[PDB]
Curated annotation (Swiss-Prot), chain B:
Lineage of the species this protein comes from: Eukaryota, Metazoa, Chordata, Craniata, Vertebrata
Pfam families referenced in this protein's UniProt entry, alphabetically: Proteasome
Full protein name: Proteasome subunit beta type-2
Modification N-acetylmethionine, positions: 1
Keywords: Acetylation, Cytoplasm, Host-virus interaction, Nucleus, Proteasome
Family assignment from sequence similarity: Belongs to the peptidase T1B family.
Compartments where found: Cytoplasm; Nucleus
Statement: the UniProt record of this protein carries the keyword Metal-binding: no
Swiss-Prot record, chain E:
GO cellular component, one term: proteasome core complex
Range covered out of full length: 46 to 261 of 264
Single Gene Ontology MF annotation: lipopolysaccharide binding
Reported disease: Proteasome-associated autoinflammatory syndrome 3: An autoinflammatory disorder characterized by onset in early infancy and recurrent fever, nodular dermatitis, myositis, panniculitis-induced lipodystrophy, lymphadenopathy, and immune dysregulation. Variable accompanying features may include joint contractures, hepatosplenomegaly, anemia, thrombocytopenia, recurrent infections, autoantibodies, and hypergammaglobulinemia. Some patients may have intracranial calcifications. PRAAS3 inheritance is autosomal recessive or digenic.
Subcellular location per the Swiss-Prot or TrEMBL entry: Cytoplasm; Nucleus
Main location as per UniProt: cytoplasm
BP terms from Gene Ontology: negative regulation of inflammatory response to antigenic stimulus; proteasome-mediated ubiquitin-dependent protein catabolic process
Phosphotyrosine: residues carrying this PTM: 57
Keywords annotated in UniProt: Acetylation, Cytoplasm, Disease variant, Host-virus interaction, Nucleus, Phosphoprotein, Proteasome
Family affiliation: Belongs to the peptidase T1B family.
Induction: Up-regulated in fibrolamellar carcinomas.
The name this protein goes by in its record: Proteasome subunit beta type-4
Swiss-Prot record, chain F:
Phosphotyrosine PTM sites in chain numbering: 122
Name under which the protein is recorded: Proteasome subunit beta type-1
Sites where a glycan is attached: 30, 181
Upper lineage: Eukaryota, Metazoa, Chordata, Craniata, Vertebrata
Any one GO biological process: proteasome-mediated ubiquitin-dependent protein catabolic process
Residues found modified as Phosphoserine: 34, 40, 134
Keyword Nucleus: yes
UniProt cross-references to InterPro entries, sorted A to Z: Ntn_hydrolases_N, Proteasome_bsu_CS, Proteasome_sua/b, Proteasome_suB-type
One GO CC annotation: nucleoplasm
Entry keyword set: Acetylation, Cytoplasm, Deafness, Glycoprotein, Host-virus interaction, Intellectual disability, Nucleus, Phosphoprotein, Proteasome
Disease listed for this protein: Neurodevelopmental disorder with microcephaly, hypotonia, and absent language: An autosomal recessive disorder characterized by microcephaly, intellectual disability with absent speech, severe developmental delay, short stature, and hypotonia. Affected individuals also manifest aggressive behavior and have hearing loss.
Keyword ATP-binding included in the entry's annotation: no
Family per record: Belongs to the peptidase T1B family.
Swiss-Prot record, chain G:
InterPro entries: Ntn_hydrolases_N, Proteasome_alpha, Proteasome_alpha-type, Proteasome_asu_N, Proteasome_sua/b
Subunit organization: The 26S proteasome consists of a 20S proteasome core and two 19S regulatory subunits. The 20S proteasome core is a barrel-shaped complex made of 28 subunits that are arranged in four stacked rings. The two outer rings are each formed by seven alpha subunits, and the two inner rings are formed by seven beta subunits. The proteolytic activity is exerted by three beta-subunits PSMB5, PSMB6 and PSMB7. PSMA7 interacts directly with the PSMG1-PSMG2 heterodimer which promotes 20S proteasome assembly. Interacts with HIF1A. Interacts with RAB7A. Interacts with PRKN. Interacts with ABL1 and ABL2. (Microbial infection) Interacts with HIV-1 TAT protein.
Cross-referenced PROSITE patterns: PROTEASOME_ALPHA_1, PROTEASOME_ALPHA_2
Protein name: Proteasome subunit alpha type-7
Subcellular locations according to the entry: Cytoplasm; Nucleus
Glycan attachment sites: 129
Superkingdom of the organism of origin: Eukaryota
Induction of synthesis: Down-regulated by the ribozyme Rz3'X. Up-regulated in colorectal cancer tissues.
Annotated NCBIfam families: PRK03996.1 (NF003075)
Family according to the record: Belongs to the peptidase T1A family.
Recorded GO CC terms: cytoplasm; cytosol; extracellular exosome; nucleoplasm; nucleus; proteasome complex; proteasome core complex; proteasome core complex, alpha-subunit complex
UniProt keyword annotation of Metal-binding present: no
Positions bearing N6-acetyllysine: 226
Amino acid sequence: AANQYDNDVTVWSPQGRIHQIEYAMEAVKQGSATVGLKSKTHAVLVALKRAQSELAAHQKKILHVDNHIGISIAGLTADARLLCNFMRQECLDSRFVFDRPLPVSRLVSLIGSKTQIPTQRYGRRPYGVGLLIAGYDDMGPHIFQTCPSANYFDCRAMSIGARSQSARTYLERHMSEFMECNLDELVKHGLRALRETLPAEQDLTTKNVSIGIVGKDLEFTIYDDDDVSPFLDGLEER
Amino acid sequence: MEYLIGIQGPDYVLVASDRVAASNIVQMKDDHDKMFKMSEKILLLCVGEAGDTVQFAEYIQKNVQLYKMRNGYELSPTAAANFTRRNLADCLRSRTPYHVNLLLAGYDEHEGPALYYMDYLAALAKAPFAAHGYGAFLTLSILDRYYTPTISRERAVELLRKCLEELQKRFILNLPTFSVRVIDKDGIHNLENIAF
Amino acid sequence: DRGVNTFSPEGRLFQVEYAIEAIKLGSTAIGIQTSEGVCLAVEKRITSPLMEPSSIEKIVEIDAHIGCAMSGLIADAKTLIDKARVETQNHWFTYNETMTVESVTQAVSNLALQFGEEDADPGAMSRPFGVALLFGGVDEKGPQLFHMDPSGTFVQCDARAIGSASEGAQSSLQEVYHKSMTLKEAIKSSLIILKQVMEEKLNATNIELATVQPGQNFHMFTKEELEEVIKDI
Amino acid sequence: RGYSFSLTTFSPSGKLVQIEYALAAVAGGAPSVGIKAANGVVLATEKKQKSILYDERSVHKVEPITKHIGLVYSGMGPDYRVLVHRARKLAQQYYLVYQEPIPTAQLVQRVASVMQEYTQSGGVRPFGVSLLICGWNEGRPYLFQSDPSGAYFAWKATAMGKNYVNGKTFLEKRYNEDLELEDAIHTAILTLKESFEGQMTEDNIEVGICNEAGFRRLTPTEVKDYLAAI
Amino acid sequence: TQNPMVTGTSVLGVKFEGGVVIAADMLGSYGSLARFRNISRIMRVNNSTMLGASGDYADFQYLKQVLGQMVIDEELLGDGHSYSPRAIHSWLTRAMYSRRSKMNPLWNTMVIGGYADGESFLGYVDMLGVAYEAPSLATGYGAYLAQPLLREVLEKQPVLSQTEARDLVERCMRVLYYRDARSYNRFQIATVTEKGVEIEGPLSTETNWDIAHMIS
Amino acid sequence: RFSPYVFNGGTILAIAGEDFAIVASDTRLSEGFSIHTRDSPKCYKLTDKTVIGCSGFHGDCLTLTKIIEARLKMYKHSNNKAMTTGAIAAMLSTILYSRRFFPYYVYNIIGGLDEEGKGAVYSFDPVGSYQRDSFKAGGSASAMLQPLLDNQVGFKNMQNVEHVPLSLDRAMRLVKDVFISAAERDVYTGDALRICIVTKEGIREETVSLRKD
Amino acid sequence: SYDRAITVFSPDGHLFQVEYAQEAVKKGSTAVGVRGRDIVVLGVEKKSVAKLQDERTVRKICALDDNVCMAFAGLTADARIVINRARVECQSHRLTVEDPVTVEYITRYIASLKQRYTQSNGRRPFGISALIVGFDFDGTPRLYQTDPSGTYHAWKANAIGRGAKSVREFLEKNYTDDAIETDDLTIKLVIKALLEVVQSGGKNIELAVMRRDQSLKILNPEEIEKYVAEIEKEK
Amino acid sequence: TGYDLSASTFSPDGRVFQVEYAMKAVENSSTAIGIRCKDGVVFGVEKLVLSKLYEEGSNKRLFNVDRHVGMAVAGLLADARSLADIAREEASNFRSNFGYNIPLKHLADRVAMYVHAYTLYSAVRPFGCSFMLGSYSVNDGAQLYMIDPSGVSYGYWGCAIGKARQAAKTEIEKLQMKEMTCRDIVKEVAKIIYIVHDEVKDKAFELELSWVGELTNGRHEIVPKDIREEAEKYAKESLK
Amino acid sequence: SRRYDSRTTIFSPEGRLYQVEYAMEAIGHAGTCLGILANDGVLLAAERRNIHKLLDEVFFSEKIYKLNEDMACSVAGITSDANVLTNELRLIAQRYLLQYQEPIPCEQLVTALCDIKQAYTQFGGKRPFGVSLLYIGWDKHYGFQLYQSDPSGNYGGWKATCIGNNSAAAVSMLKQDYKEGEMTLKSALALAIKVLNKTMDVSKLSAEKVEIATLTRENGKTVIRVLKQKEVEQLIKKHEEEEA
């Protein structure tokens, strides 16, 4: 009676809207904030980890999938782990058969065809998780937002999560010092992009910030609670 | 190459197995008792392939035991015999031929005692006395010479001792002990084991 | 109505945020990771006194060195406790070693948000598992406990409360734990159960406590050990 | 794909709502009479098309089931054609296993068996065709009728389709137990002549008989022949 | 195994400073009958990789349509990323091992070669899945006959110019014309260099039958 | 009708000292009576602390190293922890057994070092039966190298020599002489053994030639 | 192939299909059992009132194999499936370990089965509730009571029928140590407990006893009559 | 009451509303015009670049399928990308199956009946993506087709799908259609795209072109890259 | 879609089953055919559809169905469903023979049919079989016995229970008249035409509008008689005079 578009990944709203796989995009707007970016040489990923408990590992976000194609989940976590067991397993399958590194574009395209099937058929929710995958193939280190609407983006310097639009509007007006700006001064430039999604009072502490580095002549490397402490600078007071 | 024997009396039927569990060259523990306890009054025996005796006939024991402790009364030995003939006969040609040949001693209350017999091809036939194994080939004429259609119990037991002492004398396998059970209208009894 | 695989005008799934409820329903369990073990306790809420209280299994040992503590909709966990122990002995079988706690917790939480109406063969699940639990276990990394959700979200925890006492007992546990075991975390956790008390002064008939210590494998406490502890409070 | 839930269900009164609607869709169908006779039957029906435009030798309503069994309907159009397809297939299963033409009673058993599961079994609506059966089967002829429920009854005469109460009462009046050959055809013609909506054209009726030599349709030169002998 | 399959005999190849050259005769020998003469056994794939075949030719047409379809399919994703001859060698290896693993095996025994970004490549893929890399390869009886002339010069100098390698495989192909029974006169020689894959169609062998008239 | 195995030959050796594991190798893969190549390694660097040797049918050796490599990677970021050595031996035992009825005809030896640091070496039949040792070469000259380092390592059938523990100089000189002896005496010689040697600080890989015939 | 998710979480954590099965066991017979320390004993509501019954096929008292036996309460035709699958897997557990099968294990199989029908796609979890009594290898006359949510409890009275909240509070009142004897005080407690609810045992009650892994004996009108008489005399 | 929301239910006047709701679902997405001429078919797609964060070709909307036919798409890029890759698999099964390189009429009829037969069931939704094809064999002619979410496929000359196809069909109609040699019309495509783009607000019209022609011999290229600085010089024809 | 399903396999909030007790009200619309056992054999006593001439010959009726040599069944409710299931259960009977070479003691058969009919009301989303059919039979184990079942699934030995309408005319009066010890099957016919003589609109109760059928034996094998025409004209004049 009220909203007959509730039995609803088969239906269309009468304007153009599919009415819940954009609402899965709402379901990754609700998730925790993160930011990835790329240089001319190596792409980085930075994530703040929410602590909705006593204290925790704060539901560790950025994930090892790969052999240099790393991801950054936001949204649901079990569905994210299902999607990275898929992405993980067939990335290792391309290690098995072709014996080359699987290129990042075909990776993100075929998961963009794997999360697209339940959007199509009946009674099956979309994979409500916004990946922020990043890896270094033969050319420059790509970075792909993909979405629960199965529509990935070959982006550079993207931020997704809770109030991540402010991190984008910092990061949009600071693209000029990309394609330079080596690792020591790059990840500072990403953390001061992350340090706007916080509620205006809080340090990027060593607890909640977990980052990942991938690129030329280095494996996708996870920096946890201890290893993020050499990345320290700013005020921003933000 | 083992040995199963049975004699149908007027109101009973007695069976006896050879109490030897064999191997390649040696024999294992003697007892291993081949006579599988059915519900109360049925009692089947199984020789043949080492590995289908303990498997098939115990599965038949599961289904008949389930029939009794599912629907009150037990099976008559006719329906148990045709049941296991059906199950062996349709497990025969399909994928894994159960190479066992069964005796099935039993009696119903309101009919006589019955001793059913089948080969490894599950062809069933009643018999007043039946045998199995290679030891069947020499001992069966002694149950031809002396078996009246009406015989008392102790005469049938000492007749069975004639059959086992002949089987002890001529048959080349060391079968020193034999397990004997008389079943009759009070339930499954067990006669003293015959040894040498 | 609407189905199970639909998102709610709040932002979440329907069946998941409904599976966060029926955890307030059910008994309360607590666990404390220490530096030399992890203690679990649950007040299993006996209804009548006409009866036998030592067969309400709410502390279940997955392996010798992983013990879980469920609550909520009880006996819905037995399929995923079965998957926990079958996956445990599969790991020991194929790899000839112990496990972590994030591998059993990794393996169980994959089964949480795995359901649906029209899918593969009808041995699948319809509703999500409405049971929140936490695996107290000791590893070669350290003793630790992993609090699961019905959403498949599992987190590192050192002091976590579930059940109906998920606010007052959690806030009390927030201010009383920092240091280490030294034998008194198990006596300052049933004290939190002593504040929780619903029906009876927490004797050795209505609470089940079990610790996992790195020297031993586990220890499901018997009656005289429990009432040895209750006498000290 | 599929539904796997029955749309035919029980009313709160305690009856099938879809089956009485199926008998309504039968009762709004074209009228058809069937007369069991002492050596053989006659199954007449009424083919009124929209205009005088169509090929009246193209579609049939009398059509046999492969040996000596014809069946005529009243109600839905193509659901009948499905029941002819299934009925011919069941008669040929029976013929390839038992090597005789099927007894009429067993064909009505199996046709009523296939019409039952469409009152169940996954989203399918029941057929809404209460076709009636003929057949010589050895010694004495048979006649039946499979309702869209799945019931069946044998008799001496019936009608169906439009205003079938007048057909059942009128055949109850004019029937004799020895009334056997072409006199049955006569009263069948003057049962369709009762309403017909006008003028009794030979191209708008067709009959089929089971005169101990197989069911056979009647050629249009034979119906008009007895329409000359009215 | 069941029938007189239509075979080839030999695809012999050598790598050189520059690229890699492979050569094979055009022959469709139906079991001691040269039933098919003009029959190319040298597949071109994407511009930095080549492919031969020695055994059954029908299975080579199966492999030329699955290699062809795969390389055009991943060729039209845009984004650069063509197959290095790593991946054709490894995919062909896993295709044949996964093919004999079900006992329905491909019977041809080829050598694929190609010049990658840095250096050349010359890899062998066997009927059974025995796959490796080598400075110089030969298949079939060439592996008995052309292989000594190849791993004699390359043990002396492991550096060849293009004319030395081309003359070398022309001379080895002449030797297989002399000794191998299932060998035909004309042959395709085929070279991949920095500028890509190119195939010289039908060559010939200058035969030397001058020792024939000393037989009595 | 098809004979899906050949014997491509090759002999590989591993020795477990007290902080090392000398995983030797050979090079020449060959069947029938013609050799194919002289470059081919048979010791594969699995992790930084585990090296396999792998001899027998070469294509199935190759696919087996692809499977154990890809499933090592499938482990490593499913638990966020690298493999140990005994766990490699266990899962390779169930990979070799898992296809029993058309078996992996391959003799493989897993060297490497344990958790505490002491070296171990696991030996395998082609269907999977692991024992930790301090020697046991395998695969073509299995019955040739074995009695020497039954004596010069295990010190069996030998009185009071006052046997010392091995080191990276005595066992280093104990691998080259046995492969020049088997280079003389076996047919499936190898021309250049590539000793993947494992240590506590990392891994290096010495190579030296043999009897090239 | 019907795949609609029936047993789904409503709001406030309420799984309505299961509580509808709780009224479905609230609207049955009145089964009752007592763990009497050497014996166990059942009793449910006689029949109605036979008149034209057959007493052989009005059995709320069912036998699993020899020692364990159960008294269902609710819908009386979905129960018989659970009887059959209990007997089948009970024979399978005689196949593997070959024991006088323990009562704990078979009641875990029943509770796990009904919990597996609170999970699968569209099959309406059962409206039954059991009294799994019996013994084990060493006496221990354990009683178990399952639930349509698949929760089994090892309690000692568990009157779980239709008017049995009064019976379980009565049995809470009147079962401490007076029923530790052989059979008479226990069976007197059962027939007193059901004569609280209805009426004389010549038409209504029927019982069953089980003694030390032999002789599952029901009580013909005689037993019930005697019990009633004794109860009346005591009261 | 509520004859909507399921593709297996008609209207009371015969109009399956889940199809026409998918049709407006490509009318709220940008244009992609395709112009046929005697040496091949030239595509041109409007881009509505949201932020500066997306780089050049962040989302491809000129896919290719079989090394000669193209994929100017309009609607949901997930659905369009899905039928793009199964069109790749379809020409894969044709070339593998029949050897001969796929004629485009059969591919448009095949993908057309695929996306049509996908609108007959309540267990699926219709696609939300109009798209067009286009190529020529040496004896085919410059065949292009356009396919709706209804599944109907027509041969066109100058079809245009998207939001501003109400504007875009007029200029393609007034452009001389038949006899010019594709290079000029690549240049002229920018005039259509700059006319139909009627904003300056955060969409940047950063267009993209691809074709098949005698300069290509049955292929596809993003332009090569020089007309992007030559057809960019058709500014001020939309500013005057 | 989940908007379209009737949702048959749902418990009511009162705990009962909506599609099952709607079948119980389907029995009360159409249904007759009581059954009486004796020390001798058992009989059904049945009613046809109406007075409508137009009915040539039934070999057996639409009511009494033969199942073995020693069993038979009668049918209430919806006649389209039960035909199917009785052929279904007939299959069951014969395959017991194929498994056991026994004439299938009838409680096995009733248990099997009630298990599959319970399976249709358990899951599958279909409507339940709207028929409360009943059974008569004999085995060597027990005596002559009749069972009675319903679309819910339970069943029982129901020594004189009728089905269908008028439960009181047919059957509460029977539980004031049946002698449980001895019955003497001729007087069971007399009681059957008593109950059917009270449960009818007409006194014309000959075999135009009645269908009575007995099960007896001679020398061990059972005989199922359908009580041909003139026997009914015998028993209908057995009052001559009064019955109540």
